[PDB]
């Protein structure tokens, strides 16, 4: 079904974009030895 | 052909040791000995203090 | 095979592949000579 | 803050739109867009990007020149209006309807 | 939808605008000399 | 000790020593060129003229016949001399590189940042590292352009898909359409369409190398003339170990890709010098058996696919996506045309498939290349994991261990 | 001045106060692993038989179709598919998708993405907690083995039907067919893997018995000795010098790994390297680089072949091979 | 009947795993 393909595509792209933009959100700073 | 004795072997072989473990834990909770985050016994029959008071 | 003017260089060719790998063992014996500083 | 962005936005949008007008005037839009190989368009897009970011990048920080930029800003506003309609006149009429 | 690229473009836009909103109040304009950037402007 | 690294991790002492790092890198490059030249010298010394290249364990000579050096029509090897001069040139360049690396490592300027500010660098100076990356990107684009010069102007490239059995053909119309070229990159990696591996002709090859050379050149001047943006500066780790880890991830990806490439693709690796692929050999067996059965005087040797494709039956049906230069003349619109099978089967295709039957104790050079570069790609991914973790932890500052005075976990509230 | 929604989302995702750490790698790990888990459970309980061979003879793998937990499996994809991408939307019907082994492809791909993201998540939590990041390198060995058994061997053989079935008896069938076709037992990398697994069990039992032997007395009589250790204590819970003296006197005068750092490095390194090598052996045997062939290695003066143990092993391999090659 | 028993056993195992994860004994650090 095309609708199932659309839903799976948008779910996959949603989680991949969550991963990608999350690692771009200053990830090396999120560590306990952060210099204030 | 459903093996009649095999059903009891699976059921009673699972129920009886599960019952024994559950009964042992519940009476252990009543005595305050069902946690490993407590000190060793201060006296015979007296459980040690818990780590968080 | 090898060209005619360089056919006398046949025996040296067979040991040509083993020179890169023996450089790795040269690093181990160099450290063993200095006592693994 | 928004005015600083809008100021450089208007002059540079105009400046690109000027050179587009002189291109279609000396060549006599969408016809050249398709006739040109896409390697050339990628070649053009590349050299603009290096220019816009490195060699012609704005650093964030006399009566003749102050009027000349106002002339440039005014002529940029006209060149911007013409270009977006010029493609549409190629889109529908095919040729600039004189 | 139809060409399957709008699903790609549309979703990374929506999460992209959320990321851009977070990026707006980040004082990352100044360049640092370090192995990693420890500056993260947490509003709350 | 002084740096804390033991002897078994002694090359880690060269991280902040740029002069000796340059010496070590140039010496390793000299070793690489030495192996290249010595291996092609070894292969030409043991080369038997009557046997094919894949029957005598040759991996470097087939890389030269693909470039159109010393190869005749049909894949025949004519002259060994071009391979010999390639080997001699690589030997001499290796001697030069080894001398330069030994000099820079031993008696060269140690920590050359002060003496040569153009060559000196700091790992955190993002402008300098982007400049170095841009220069080397320009060199890589120049190398791709050198391959295009070989393909389109100097001699040519061996086209295995040429009519009659393949020939060295000079390509004059490269596929410059970015839709096809980048649809190869954006192609799915599964069966049927095999991502970049599915390149089936010389035109897309030389056109894609034109596009890659142009992209590498413009990216090189871009990285030379610019600096990383704020998002890139806040995302990455700016240290030598981090750059090594990124390179390790990229090199691992490329190693796995080349392993699958030499396993499946028969265009950049023709079956005349590297031998047939696995699917190629299986369909060769099926095709030669069908030729015998047809010469004896639907058939069980073929089957009708659900997509209307006439393909070989049996266990060979899983390789129905195989394309070979000796099947395509007999393959029409719906696949294996029955009319084309027994009408115009040329005798050069008959011997080639019979030759590929026996090369189904023997290990093909495709198998050696695939297995070796796969091993290297996987272990380079492992090295990427190691160096990426160590770079991130050393940048943050706890690569030496957990500080006893301020343990981070003790300051967090309990999980439950 | 209010915090953006993305800031709160990033704070919650990378929070170390969650019961299970999520992280950015977990943003890929949790939906993929929960997809493969539910799909595996459904396909294991109820799924119609899969025609794996491609010749209209299906193999039953679900509980509802007459097999138990041992013989139950998610049968690999059909031989007609090969290495073709077969999602649920590219099949004409759900019945045809289940007939061709689509659940195998779905579960395997989601599981592979999930375990790679699990490696990344282990690194991520090691980074947020301020510890050294090489547990993920240790987990990279079973992940490599799973990749070689589920993805890479089908790539080399050209069909996902040759992948390992997601079941117990299917795993045994994969092992027997692999031995018949490649002689993995005589492969040096499988020998390194068996050495790694056997040695890992040896070293685990050895280290555990050495520590358990030298526990310092802290509890009363017949009370469990595990109460002698306090969670978060600083002092050592066992006598290291006594265990070292025992291990030294056990084999030869000075053999104890006196430094516990290199002892634990050796413990972490030996089975990981062994599993790495057996994974690479399985992956290289996908491209027909088989194990050692010592067939007909001993002949008499007149040329007659004197068998060895390798010949008996070859006879077993030949029996499995002729029973597997169904009308080759 | 047998498949029902197999399903019950597997689901019960997963329930035990769920309880062992989320209703575990909370680790307390000794003071
Ligand atoms: C990228 C995403 C990777 C995931 C892909 C896994 C499946 C890849 C596949 O089915 O693999 C096969 C494809 C190759 O595609 C093949 O490509 C072939 C192309 O050949 C065609 O074209 C050739 C042109 O000469 C010949 O003519 C040939 O006869 C003709 O058929 C055919 O299309 C085949 O059907 C098609 O399978 O690989 C690919 O596309 C590229 C493979 C990428 C490298 C392998 C991935 C890395 C390994 C997984 C990670 C393991 C990591 C372990 C650590 C954890
Ligand atoms: C281009 C690739 C590259 C580069 C430049 C580096 C660079 C570095 N690494 Mg990294 N690494 C890589 C790839 C790389 N590595 C890969 C692919 C892996 C996965 C195996 C690793 C895993 C790794 C670890 C686990 C460690 C390093 C460490 C180091 C540092 C010291 C290395 C050293 O002193 O060598 C010494 C070299 C040896 C002792 C050689 C050992 C013998 C090898 C394994 C033989 C291999 C067999 C060979 C192919 C055939 C030989 C057969 C026979 C002749 C014996 C140095 C900064 C060390 C450091 O402390 O961190 C910064 C460290 O602990 N690396
Ligand atoms: C690709 C291999 C390679 C290369 C190029 C290097 C490079 C280097 N290493 Mg590493 N190393 C390696 C592999 C390598 N290493 C391996 C496998 C190990 C594990 C055993 C090490 C362990 C190690 C340690 C423990 C140390 C180094 C150090 C160094 C640096 C100084 C070496 C020195 O002082 O030599 C002196 C050598 C001699 C006096 C004897 C050798 C003389 C020459 C070089 C022998 C070869 C001659 C050659 C054939 C001549 C051809 C010339 C002709 C072509 C014209 C140098 C940049 C040091 C460092 O990091 O910084 C100072 C250091 O402390 N290395
Ligand atoms: C990846 C690069 C590569 C590839 C694909 C090949 C492929 C081939 N070579 Mg060549 N070669 C290479 C690099 C390569 N070689 C290098 C670096 C050297 C220098 C040592 C040589 C020297 C060489 C010679 C002298 C000859 C070949 C020949 C051959 C052929 C037969 C090989 C054979 O007999 O198996 C032997 C199989 C083995 C030795 C298996 C053991 C492999 C090491 C296993 C150890 C595992 C791993 C490295 C451990 C790493 C540690 C880990 C922690 C990372 C085959 C086509 C022969 C021929 O047919 O062509 C003329 C031939 O005479 N090779
Ligand atoms: C990656 C290649 C590379 C790089 C970046 C360098 C870097 C450098 N070299 Mg080395 N070297 C190399 C490879 C390299 N070398 C090779 C292949 C050889 C063999 C010919 C040498 C042998 C060598 C010698 C004999 C000398 C250098 C010198 C220099 C320095 C001055 C070069 C210059 O003024 O250029 C100018 C370019 C732009 C301004 C510079 C730091 C000099 C030196 O190190 O200091 C005195 C010098 O005398 N090199
Ligand atoms: C060897 C390949 C290579 C490497 C290591 C880099 C390195 C980098 N690039 Mg460059 N790039 C390349 C090839 C490369 N580039 C090519 C061939 C082009 C031409 C299309 C570019 C054009 C390019 C742009 C337009 C940008 C980068 C950016 C970046 C940075 C972030 C990349 C990322 O996060 O994804 C990083 C420093 C970003 C950066 O911030 O600018 C330097 C960015 O915006 N690159
Ligand atoms: C033991 C180390 C070792 C050895 C011996 C080899 C050996 C080989 N590899 Mg492998 N490699 C290794 C380690 C090794 N590799 C590791 C650890 C990785 C990362 C995992 C790789 C990644 C890798 C890839 C990705 C590929 C190879 C390939 C190859 C083969 C060809 C190499 C080549 O042509 O490069 C040459 C590269 C250069 C940069 C040299 C300069 C190139 C410019 C040449 C221009 C020529 C031009 C036409 C001249 C025109 C002149 C005219 C105009 C006048 C060769 C058998 C290739 C192969 O065929 O498939 C497996 C391939 O695609 N390797
Ligand atoms: C196989 C099926 C049959 C067996 C059934 C097995 C159960 C599978 C059900 C799948 C869903 C699982 C729900 C429980 C997970 C959860 O909610 O955690 C709640 C916690 C904290 O909750 C939050 O915690 C907050 C308090 S604090 O943050 O901890 O301080 C609190 O404010 C907030 O209310 C609360 O939401 O959140 C997390 O840890 C993230 C959970 C990620 C979800 C994936 C679950 C993985 C499955 C677990 C293993 C199953 C075996
Ligand atoms: C200032 C310079 C200028 C002149 C002098 C001019 C002239 C004409 N325009 Mg144009 N045009 C723009 C600029 C100019 N137009 C701009 C900025 C836009 C984008 C908003 C634009 C868009 C359209 C569209 C969609 C259509 C269009 C047309 C005509 C046509 C009317 C016929 C008439 O006068 O009776 C005459 C020649 C119609 C057409 O093409 O023929 C029917 C038509 O459908 N225009
Ligand atoms: C620093 C260091 C190092 C390194 C170094 C290196 C690695 C080096 C390299 C080196 C090199 C890399 C070398 C090269 C050389 C070469 C040569 C020396 C050449 C020669 C040639 C010839 C002699 C030839 C001849 C011929 C001909 C022409 C023809 C045919 C025949 C023949 C072949 C004979 C080491 C680690 C060790 C140690 C530590 C320190
Ligand atoms: C030669 C040739 C060719 C080719 C060409 C081309 C066109 C290419 C391209 C290529 C390309 C175009 C590539 C690309 C790539 C990309 C990549 C590889 C990416 C990656 C990424 C990354 C790495 C990132 C990451 C991240 C994230 C995601 C998040 C945040 C963090 C980070 C940043 C880390 C062809 C095939 C046609 C044909 C044959 C020949
Ligand atoms: Fe321990």
PDB file of N, CA and C in Angstrom, chain F residues 190-192 263-264 315 317-321 363 367 370-371 374-375 378-379 381-382 386 389-390 392-393 396 398-399 402 408 412-413 415, chain G residues 16-19 79 83-85 109 119 123 127 129-134 144 152 155-157 159 162 189 276-277 280 283-284 287 289 328:
ATOM      1  N   UNK F 190      20.463  -2.403  -2.729  1.00  0.00           N
ATOM      2  CA  UNK F 190      19.988  -3.774  -2.630  1.00  0.00           C
ATOM      3  C   UNK F 190      20.061  -4.472  -3.989  1.00  0.00           C
ATOM      4  N   UNK F 191      19.407  -5.627  -4.103  1.00  0.00           N
ATOM      5  CA  UNK F 191      19.436  -6.375  -5.346  1.00  0.00           C
ATOM      6  C   UNK F 191      18.727  -5.654  -6.476  1.00  0.00           C
ATOM      7  N   UNK F 192      19.125  -6.000  -7.697  1.00  0.00           N
ATOM      8  CA  UNK F 192      18.603  -5.338  -8.873  1.00  0.00           C
ATOM      9  C   UNK F 192      19.425  -4.121  -9.239  1.00  0.00           C
ATOM     10  N   UNK F 263      33.730  -7.632  -5.967  1.00  0.00           N
ATOM     11  CA  UNK F 263      32.976  -8.881  -5.971  1.00  0.00           C
ATOM     12  C   UNK F 263      31.909  -8.904  -7.062  1.00  0.00           C
ATOM     13  N   UNK F 264      31.217  -7.787  -7.288  1.00  0.00           N
ATOM     14  CA  UNK F 264      30.051  -7.785  -8.167  1.00  0.00           C
ATOM     15  C   UNK F 264      30.291  -7.144  -9.527  1.00  0.00           C
ATOM     16  N   UNK F 315      19.013 -23.342  -9.425  1.00  0.00           N
ATOM     17  CA  UNK F 315      19.561 -22.473  -8.390  1.00  0.00           C
ATOM     18  C   UNK F 315      20.163 -21.198  -8.960  1.00  0.00           C
ATOM     19  N   UNK F 317      18.687 -19.033 -10.709  1.00  0.00           N
ATOM     20  CA  UNK F 317      17.665 -18.002 -10.851  1.00  0.00           C
ATOM     21  C   UNK F 317      17.851 -16.842  -9.884  1.00  0.00           C
ATOM     22  N   UNK F 318      18.640 -17.016  -8.823  1.00  0.00           N
ATOM     23  CA  UNK F 318      18.889 -15.914  -7.902  1.00  0.00           C
ATOM     24  C   UNK F 318      19.875 -14.905  -8.466  1.00  0.00           C
ATOM     25  N   UNK F 319      20.596 -15.262  -9.527  1.00  0.00           N
ATOM     26  CA  UNK F 319      21.549 -14.374 -10.178  1.00  0.00           C
ATOM     27  C   UNK F 319      20.997 -13.795 -11.475  1.00  0.00           C
ATOM     28  N   UNK F 320      19.680 -13.582 -11.543  1.00  0.00           N
ATOM     29  CA  UNK F 320      19.048 -13.103 -12.766  1.00  0.00           C
ATOM     30  C   UNK F 320      19.350 -11.639 -13.064  1.00  0.00           C
ATOM     31  N   UNK F 321      19.967 -10.916 -12.136  1.00  0.00           N
ATOM     32  CA  UNK F 321      20.371  -9.537 -12.366  1.00  0.00           C
ATOM     33  C   UNK F 321      21.776  -9.424 -12.939  1.00  0.00           C
ATOM     34  N   UNK F 363      41.348 -20.174  -5.797  1.00  0.00           N
ATOM     35  CA  UNK F 363      40.786 -18.947  -5.250  1.00  0.00           C
ATOM     36  C   UNK F 363      40.980 -17.858  -6.293  1.00  0.00           C
ATOM     37  N   UNK F 367      38.045 -13.033  -5.230  1.00  0.00           N
ATOM     38  CA  UNK F 367      37.850 -13.502  -3.862  1.00  0.00           C
ATOM     39  C   UNK F 367      38.924 -12.958  -2.930  1.00  0.00           C
ATOM     40  N   UNK F 370      38.270  -9.132  -2.481  1.00  0.00           N
ATOM     41  CA  UNK F 370      37.057  -8.938  -1.697  1.00  0.00           C
ATOM     42  C   UNK F 370      37.291  -9.248  -0.224  1.00  0.00           C
ATOM     43  N   UNK F 371      37.847 -10.428   0.063  1.00  0.00           N
ATOM     44  CA  UNK F 371      38.042 -10.851   1.446  1.00  0.00           C
ATOM     45  C   UNK F 371      39.058  -9.972   2.168  1.00  0.00           C
ATOM     46  N   UNK F 374      37.677  -6.430   2.639  1.00  0.00           N
ATOM     47  CA  UNK F 374      36.604  -6.459   3.624  1.00  0.00           C
ATOM     48  C   UNK F 374      37.152  -6.558   5.040  1.00  0.00           C
ATOM     49  N   UNK F 375      38.154  -7.421   5.240  1.00  0.00           N
ATOM     50  CA  UNK F 375      38.821  -7.537   6.533  1.00  0.00           C
ATOM     51  C   UNK F 375      39.377  -6.188   6.973  1.00  0.00           C
ATOM     52  N   UNK F 378      36.449  -3.641   7.849  1.00  0.00           N
ATOM     53  CA  UNK F 378      35.848  -3.882   9.158  1.00  0.00           C
ATOM     54  C   UNK F 378      36.778  -3.446  10.283  1.00  0.00           C
ATOM     55  N   UNK F 379      38.063  -3.800  10.185  1.00  0.00           N
ATOM     56  CA  UNK F 379      38.948  -3.437  11.283  1.00  0.00           C
ATOM     57  C   UNK F 379      39.239  -1.943  11.297  1.00  0.00           C
ATOM     58  N   UNK F 381      36.809   0.187  10.647  1.00  0.00           N
ATOM     59  CA  UNK F 381      35.637   0.662  11.384  1.00  0.00           C
ATOM     60  C   UNK F 381      35.836   0.508  12.891  1.00  0.00           C
ATOM     61  N   UNK F 382      36.434  -0.611  13.306  1.00  0.00           N
ATOM     62  CA  UNK F 382      36.765  -0.814  14.719  1.00  0.00           C
ATOM     63  C   UNK F 382      37.745   0.257  15.196  1.00  0.00           C
ATOM     64  N   UNK F 386      37.387   3.119  18.179  1.00  0.00           N
ATOM     65  CA  UNK F 386      38.398   3.341  19.211  1.00  0.00           C
ATOM     66  C   UNK F 386      38.883   4.786  19.222  1.00  0.00           C
ATOM     67  N   UNK F 389      36.068   7.450  20.116  1.00  0.00           N
ATOM     68  CA  UNK F 389      35.821   7.478  21.545  1.00  0.00           C
ATOM     69  C   UNK F 389      36.959   8.122  22.311  1.00  0.00           C
ATOM     70  N   UNK F 390      38.200   7.743  21.983  1.00  0.00           N
ATOM     71  CA  UNK F 390      39.341   8.288  22.708  1.00  0.00           C
ATOM     72  C   UNK F 390      39.511   9.779  22.456  1.00  0.00           C
ATOM     73  N   UNK F 392      37.066  11.983  21.704  1.00  0.00           N
ATOM     74  CA  UNK F 392      36.014  12.688  22.432  1.00  0.00           C
ATOM     75  C   UNK F 392      36.291  12.709  23.934  1.00  0.00           C
ATOM     76  N   UNK F 393      36.742  11.579  24.491  1.00  0.00           N
ATOM     77  CA  UNK F 393      36.999  11.507  25.927  1.00  0.00           C
ATOM     78  C   UNK F 393      38.234  12.309  26.322  1.00  0.00           C
ATOM     79  N   UNK F 396      37.189  15.994  26.223  1.00  0.00           N
ATOM     80  CA  UNK F 396      36.410  16.331  27.411  1.00  0.00           C
ATOM     81  C   UNK F 396      37.271  16.303  28.668  1.00  0.00           C
ATOM     82  N   UNK F 398      38.480  13.143  30.461  1.00  0.00           N
ATOM     83  CA  UNK F 398      38.454  11.981  31.344  1.00  0.00           C
ATOM     84  C   UNK F 398      38.916  10.713  30.634  1.00  0.00           C
ATOM     85  N   UNK F 399      39.879  10.839  29.720  1.00  0.00           N
ATOM     86  CA  UNK F 399      40.438   9.663  29.067  1.00  0.00           C
ATOM     87  C   UNK F 399      41.449   8.946  29.954  1.00  0.00           C
ATOM     88  N   UNK F 402      38.317   8.079  35.864  1.00  0.00           N
ATOM     89  CA  UNK F 402      37.372   8.856  36.656  1.00  0.00           C
ATOM     90  C   UNK F 402      38.105   9.491  37.829  1.00  0.00           C
ATOM     91  N   UNK F 408      31.420  11.992  38.704  1.00  0.00           N
ATOM     92  CA  UNK F 408      30.164  12.557  38.173  1.00  0.00           C
ATOM     93  C   UNK F 408      28.905  11.816  38.594  1.00  0.00           C
ATOM     94  N   UNK F 412      24.725  12.785  40.785  1.00  0.00           N
ATOM     95  CA  UNK F 412      23.406  12.616  40.193  1.00  0.00           C
ATOM     96  C   UNK F 412      22.456  11.959  41.186  1.00  0.00           C
ATOM     97  N   UNK F 413      21.173  12.278  41.044  1.00  0.00           N
ATOM     98  CA  UNK F 413      20.151  11.691  41.888  1.00  0.00           C
ATOM     99  C   UNK F 413      19.946  10.223  41.508  1.00  0.00           C
ATOM    100  N   UNK F 415      18.585   6.616  40.281  1.00  0.00           N
ATOM    101  CA  UNK F 415      17.781   6.243  39.121  1.00  0.00           C
ATOM    102  C   UNK F 415      16.359   5.867  39.520  1.00  0.00           C
TER     103      UNK F 415
ATOM    104  N   UNK G  16      20.697  12.053  31.979  1.00  0.00           N
ATOM    105  CA  UNK G  16      21.206  10.897  32.700  1.00  0.00           C
ATOM    106  C   UNK G  16      20.295  10.480  33.844  1.00  0.00           C
ATOM    107  N   UNK G  17      19.177  11.177  34.041  1.00  0.00           N
ATOM    108  CA  UNK G  17      18.228  10.834  35.090  1.00  0.00           C
ATOM    109  C   UNK G  17      17.121   9.907  34.610  1.00  0.00           C
ATOM    110  N   UNK G  18      17.070   9.597  33.318  1.00  0.00           N
ATOM    111  CA  UNK G  18      16.095   8.641  32.818  1.00  0.00           C
ATOM    112  C   UNK G  18      16.455   7.238  33.290  1.00  0.00           C
ATOM    113  N   UNK G  19      15.421   6.422  33.519  1.00  0.00           N
ATOM    114  CA  UNK G  19      15.626   5.057  33.997  1.00  0.00           C
ATOM    115  C   UNK G  19      16.423   4.240  32.986  1.00  0.00           C
ATOM    116  N   UNK G  79      14.213 -17.585  -2.141  1.00  0.00           N
ATOM    117  CA  UNK G  79      15.323 -17.565  -3.087  1.00  0.00           C
ATOM    118  C   UNK G  79      14.992 -16.727  -4.315  1.00  0.00           C
ATOM    119  N   UNK G  83      18.821 -10.856  -2.982  1.00  0.00           N
ATOM    120  CA  UNK G  83      19.240  -9.744  -2.137  1.00  0.00           C
ATOM    121  C   UNK G  83      18.428  -8.509  -2.500  1.00  0.00           C
ATOM    122  N   UNK G  84      17.265  -8.719  -3.110  1.00  0.00           N
ATOM    123  CA  UNK G  84      16.390  -7.613  -3.470  1.00  0.00           C
ATOM    124  C   UNK G  84      15.732  -7.031  -2.230  1.00  0.00           C
ATOM    125  N   UNK G  85      15.575  -5.712  -2.225  1.00  0.00           N
ATOM    126  CA  UNK G  85      14.849  -5.045  -1.154  1.00  0.00           C
ATOM    127  C   UNK G  85      13.372  -5.390  -1.267  1.00  0.00           C
ATOM    128  N   UNK G 109      16.704  -6.252   9.157  1.00  0.00           N
ATOM    129  CA  UNK G 109      17.184  -4.896   8.904  1.00  0.00           C
ATOM    130  C   UNK G 109      16.986  -4.002  10.125  1.00  0.00           C
ATOM    131  N   UNK G 119      25.558   0.069  19.922  1.00  0.00           N
ATOM    132  CA  UNK G 119      26.985   0.381  20.066  1.00  0.00           C
ATOM    133  C   UNK G 119      27.175   1.875  20.307  1.00  0.00           C
ATOM    134  N   UNK G 123      28.546   4.025  23.732  1.00  0.00           N
ATOM    135  CA  UNK G 123      29.513   5.125  23.745  1.00  0.00           C
ATOM    136  C   UNK G 123      28.900   6.383  24.349  1.00  0.00           C
ATOM    137  N   UNK G 127      30.062   8.563  27.556  1.00  0.00           N
ATOM    138  CA  UNK G 127      30.470   9.962  27.466  1.00  0.00           C
ATOM    139  C   UNK G 127      29.736  10.831  28.484  1.00  0.00           C
ATOM    140  N   UNK G 129      28.562   9.957  31.347  1.00  0.00           N
ATOM    141  CA  UNK G 129      28.960   9.602  32.701  1.00  0.00           C
ATOM    142  C   UNK G 129      30.425   9.904  32.989  1.00  0.00           C
ATOM    143  N   UNK G 130      31.189  10.332  31.989  1.00  0.00           N
ATOM    144  CA  UNK G 130      32.579  10.676  32.210  1.00  0.00           C
ATOM    145  C   UNK G 130      33.523   9.508  32.365  1.00  0.00           C
ATOM    146  N   UNK G 131      33.240   8.382  31.718  1.00  0.00           N
ATOM    147  CA  UNK G 131      34.107   7.214  31.769  1.00  0.00           C
ATOM    148  C   UNK G 131      34.761   6.975  30.412  1.00  0.00           C
ATOM    149  N   UNK G 132      35.650   5.985  30.375  1.00  0.00           N
ATOM    150  CA  UNK G 132      36.379   5.687  29.155  1.00  0.00           C
ATOM    151  C   UNK G 132      35.493   4.928  28.163  1.00  0.00           C
ATOM    152  N   UNK G 133      35.581   5.265  26.881  1.00  0.00           N
ATOM    153  CA  UNK G 133      34.592   4.797  25.904  1.00  0.00           C
ATOM    154  C   UNK G 133      34.950   3.557  25.102  1.00  0.00           C
ATOM    155  N   UNK G 134      35.312   2.438  25.720  1.00  0.00           N
ATOM    156  CA  UNK G 134      35.708   1.281  24.926  1.00  0.00           C
ATOM    157  C   UNK G 134      34.879   0.040  25.216  1.00  0.00           C
ATOM    158  N   UNK G 144      29.562  -7.638  14.978  1.00  0.00           N
ATOM    159  CA  UNK G 144      30.216  -8.074  13.748  1.00  0.00           C
ATOM    160  C   UNK G 144      29.830  -9.502  13.393  1.00  0.00           C
ATOM    161  N   UNK G 152      26.100 -10.244   5.681  1.00  0.00           N
ATOM    162  CA  UNK G 152      27.270 -10.291   4.815  1.00  0.00           C
ATOM    163  C   UNK G 152      27.362 -11.633   4.095  1.00  0.00           C
ATOM    164  N   UNK G 155      25.070 -11.423   1.295  1.00  0.00           N
ATOM    165  CA  UNK G 155      25.636 -10.576   0.244  1.00  0.00           C
ATOM    166  C   UNK G 155      26.611 -11.375  -0.611  1.00  0.00           C
ATOM    167  N   UNK G 156      27.495 -12.134   0.039  1.00  0.00           N
ATOM    168  CA  UNK G 156      28.451 -12.941  -0.699  1.00  0.00           C
ATOM    169  C   UNK G 156      27.802 -14.078  -1.462  1.00  0.00           C
ATOM    170  N   UNK G 157      26.801 -14.720  -0.864  1.00  0.00           N
ATOM    171  CA  UNK G 157      26.124 -15.820  -1.537  1.00  0.00           C
ATOM    172  C   UNK G 157      25.047 -15.345  -2.502  1.00  0.00           C
ATOM    173  N   UNK G 159      21.912 -14.135  -1.824  1.00  0.00           N
ATOM    174  CA  UNK G 159      20.519 -14.370  -1.463  1.00  0.00           C
ATOM    175  C   UNK G 159      20.355 -14.301   0.046  1.00  0.00           C
ATOM    176  N   UNK G 162      20.084 -17.568   2.279  1.00  0.00           N
ATOM    177  CA  UNK G 162      21.249 -18.198   2.877  1.00  0.00           C
ATOM    178  C   UNK G 162      21.620 -17.594   4.223  1.00  0.00           C
ATOM    179  N   UNK G 189      40.268 -19.151  11.350  1.00  0.00           N
ATOM    180  CA  UNK G 189      39.575 -18.090  12.070  1.00  0.00           C
ATOM    181  C   UNK G 189      38.489 -18.650  12.980  1.00  0.00           C
ATOM    182  N   UNK G 276      35.952 -11.384  16.932  1.00  0.00           N
ATOM    183  CA  UNK G 276      36.283 -10.600  15.742  1.00  0.00           C
ATOM    184  C   UNK G 276      36.820 -11.494  14.634  1.00  0.00           C
ATOM    185  N   UNK G 277      37.742 -12.389  14.986  1.00  0.00           N
ATOM    186  CA  UNK G 277      38.350 -13.244  13.977  1.00  0.00           C
ATOM    187  C   UNK G 277      37.366 -14.281  13.450  1.00  0.00           C
ATOM    188  N   UNK G 280      35.087 -12.432  11.033  1.00  0.00           N
ATOM    189  CA  UNK G 280      35.753 -12.196   9.761  1.00  0.00           C
ATOM    190  C   UNK G 280      35.973 -13.492   8.995  1.00  0.00           C
ATOM    191  N   UNK G 283      32.628 -14.120   7.407  1.00  0.00           N
ATOM    192  CA  UNK G 283      32.418 -13.139   6.349  1.00  0.00           C
ATOM    193  C   UNK G 283      33.297 -13.417   5.132  1.00  0.00           C
ATOM    194  N   UNK G 284      34.521 -13.904   5.346  1.00  0.00           N
ATOM    195  CA  UNK G 284      35.389 -14.230   4.220  1.00  0.00           C
ATOM    196  C   UNK G 284      34.984 -15.534   3.547  1.00  0.00           C
ATOM    197  N   UNK G 287      32.594 -15.288   0.473  1.00  0.00           N
ATOM    198  CA  UNK G 287      33.174 -15.107  -0.850  1.00  0.00           C
ATOM    199  C   UNK G 287      34.049 -16.286  -1.257  1.00  0.00           C
ATOM    200  N   UNK G 289      36.250 -18.208   0.216  1.00  0.00           N
ATOM    201  CA  UNK G 289      37.604 -18.424   0.725  1.00  0.00           C
ATOM    202  C   UNK G 289      37.483 -19.393   1.897  1.00  0.00           C
ATOM    203  N   UNK G 328      20.639 -30.314  -7.726  1.00  0.00           N
ATOM    204  CA  UNK G 328      21.561 -29.305  -8.241  1.00  0.00           C
ATOM    205  C   UNK G 328      21.837 -29.538  -9.723  1.00  0.00           C
TER     206      UNK G 328
END
